[PDB]
Amino acid sequence: MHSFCAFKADDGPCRACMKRFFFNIFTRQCEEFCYGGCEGNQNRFESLEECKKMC
């Protein structure tokens, strides 16, 4: 696995809701979340396909 696939999803400190996807290590599935718009980590993708391809 790419290491970042095992990062905890992080909405970051900003308070937007930008729709993104992360790889959920418990469910082995990509899930939608509100990314706040800044900071966060690389377990963040624009589409389910990018999350599925990377993880």
């Binding site: 909405d11 900003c14 308070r15 937007a16 809701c17 729709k19 509100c34 706040g36 718009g37 800044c38």
Partner: protein, 224 residues
């Protein structure tokens, strides 16, 4: 908004939403044709929605206006969040009525202990996800700059101030960004950031609109 209450319908006619596929941020109507929001809400295409209460069940009295110009503060920095403020010029003036009207710019900066009103469609849970359809409100006081800085060491710039409760339980949250902090009938803050939502000793951090009144007027005039 965590720990708040549901705003009375159309009781905040200055409250707007930014939309691009979905509701992603708030904003404040400050003139017929201009909205203030946070720079981190920037997108290249935005539909502004005005007069809303329930964002999913439209009454048919709302206004939907595309952003014609979207201008972030030129000293906005995505990493430090310094100068987290942005102006939107609507492609046509909003129709001012009982449900859509402006909020006054501040004539003095916010004083510690002043009671403000914070609003938006953000998450209502600190440790879960519940995104409300109806606009939420929160009364909260301005904190001292010392309490602000102590809560976020090294991170509070001159463009920022804290509003909320050090004990936790009441705060703005994701999807509230860009929305208003109103104190004494004036726009004092823009919802910006915090470490989590409504966590102990991690109050919300807001852009200090007072510091930008001149930039706002210059930008409006230069784009008129």
């Amino acid at each position: 908004i965590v720990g708040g209450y549901t705003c009375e319908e159309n009781s905040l006619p200055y409250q707007v939403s930014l939309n691009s596929g979905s509701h992603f941020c708030g904003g404040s109507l400050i003139s017929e044709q201009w909205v203030v929001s946070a720079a981190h809400c920037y997108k290249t295409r935005i539909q502004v929605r005005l007069g809303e209460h329930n964002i999913k069940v439209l009454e048919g009295n709302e206004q939907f206006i595309n952003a014609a110009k979207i201008i972030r503060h030129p000293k906005y920095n995505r990493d430090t969040l310094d100068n987290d403020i942005m102006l939107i010029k609507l492609s046509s003036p909003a129709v001012i009525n009982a449900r859509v009207s402006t909020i006054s710019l501040p004539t003095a900066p916010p004083a510690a202990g002043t009671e403000c009103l914070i609003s938006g469609w953000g998450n209502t849970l600190s440790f879960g996800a519940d995104y409300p359809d109806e606009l939420k409100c929160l009364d909260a006081p301005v904190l001292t700059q010392a309490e602000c800085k102590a809560s976020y060491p090294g991170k509070i710039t001159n463009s920022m101030f804290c509003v909320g409760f050090l004990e936790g339980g009441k705060d703005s949250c994701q999807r509230d960004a860009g929305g208003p902090v109103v104190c004494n009938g004036q726009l004092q803050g823009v919802v910006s950031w915090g470490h989590g939502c409504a966590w102990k000793n991690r109050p919300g951090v807001y852009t200090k609109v007072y510091n930008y009144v001149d930039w706002i007027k210059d930008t409006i005039a230069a784009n008129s």
